[PDB]
Amino acid sequence: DTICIGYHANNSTDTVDTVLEKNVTVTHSVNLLEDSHNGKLCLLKGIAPLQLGNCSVAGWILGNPECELLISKESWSYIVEKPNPENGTCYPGHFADYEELREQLSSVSSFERFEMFPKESSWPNHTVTGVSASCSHNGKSSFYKNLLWLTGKNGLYPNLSKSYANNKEKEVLVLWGVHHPPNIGDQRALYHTENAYVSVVSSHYSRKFTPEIAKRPKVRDQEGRINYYWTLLEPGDTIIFEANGNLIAPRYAFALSRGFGSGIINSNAPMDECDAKCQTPQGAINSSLPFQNVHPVTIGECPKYVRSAKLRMVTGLRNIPSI
């Protein structure tokens, strides 16, 4: 024969933490903490990631025909790679500012390639074929796609120079390599010179990188090496060459505008046309809940990685139901 006042008790068993008392039942609670992710690689905000293959960023722009796959595409938010990659440095050696180019081949807006110095109709009086068993394509031993090799011509190596003049209205990235053979006989019989010089010219940039010979080690087939280098040119700038030989000349040079510099993920997850705002080296992530936990390394505008065990926020009150 009474009137009471009371509160809600639910069918829900959810433990939460408070600064006062931890781990108690509540009628409503929101998980806040993010412990969940996609498990597949997605496209970040309108634009896709670079579907690479088995080469590398190095393999992509050095142009080993073992990834003749990469040529056509235009734009990507971030590149992909595996830990597996075989083909990058086709003819063994180091790549100049490698990992700096990885910070300037990430953020990609538009790509258009032009054969800057062709095999046919660019260098007369100098042999335009170049073959090494370190750089092979299924039985054949043909060179890269976007760089070409010079040796001497008819027992000789006549004088030369190449002065390109950019006008494409947007910036262009250029690629080349210097030669270092082990054997003196290998050096002498190839470039027919004793002290040869290399001139690389720009309004700011210039390095007189010299070949030098010794007893460099074996990465199968080649005891010698070829080392690759680069520089940038904006509209109205001039890259000038003056060589004697010993040089893998700039051939196909990549044109790109760009402004910012994003990132490059390397993983294994399959490409899906999923529109995701953020990506981990394991999958893709939301942007709803302000903080997440899968990996410290992420790409985009993301919920921030936390070490938390349980950030289950309470949206209800205590539970003593039944009857």
Binding site: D1, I3, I5, G6, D17, T18, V297, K304, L317
Partner: protein, 160 residues
């Protein structure tokens, strides 16, 4: 809790109503159920969404680059990157940790006063023509039915 209400004097809750969050039980003649509530619910819920959502909808971001990939030569800068990453990770972990558990103390004491409102919403008009005990349920001398037991909801009654 901080009020002898939730957990306290009101002891346990009810497996009752589907809709509202608070309310009242009665026995007089007909009904013996729990009449939800809107003014206490549709404003305590109203605030909670404003709350929770504000913890969700405020901290923004622009396009950020997290990865760098350093080398065995430039190792000094590897620890610079590393030192930055788990600089923020430490803060974000520790903050989002502390704000939750500290804000779980709000949401719990939010009901702890919000319910106490309704127990003190019964006393503040009709005074002692009802026996005042601990449980949070008072009897009534002149017994009032489904019309005027419904007049408890808003607080419309004859005399003290």
């Amino acid at each position: 809790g901080l009020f002898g209400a939730i957990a306290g004097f009101i002891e346990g809750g009810w497996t009752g109503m589907v809709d509202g969050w608070y309310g009242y039980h009665h026995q007089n003649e007909q009904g013996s159920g729990y009449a939800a509530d809107q003014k206490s619910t549709q404003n305590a819920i109203n605030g909670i969404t404003n709350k929770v959502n504000s913890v969700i909808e405020k901290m923004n971001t622009q396009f950020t680059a997290v990865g760098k990939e350093f080398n065995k030569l430039e190792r000094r800068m590897e620890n610079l990157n590393k030192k930055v990453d788990d600089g923020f990770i430490d803060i974000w972990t520790y903050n989002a940790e502390l704000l939750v558990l500290l804000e779980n103390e709000r949401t719990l004491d939010f009901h702890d006063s919000n319910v106490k409102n309704l127990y003190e919403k019964v006393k503040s008009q009709l005074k002692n023509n009802a026996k005042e005990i601990g449980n949070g349920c008072f009897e009534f001398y002149h017994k009032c039915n489904d019309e005027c037991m419904e007049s408890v909801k808003n607080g419309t009654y004859d005399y003290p």
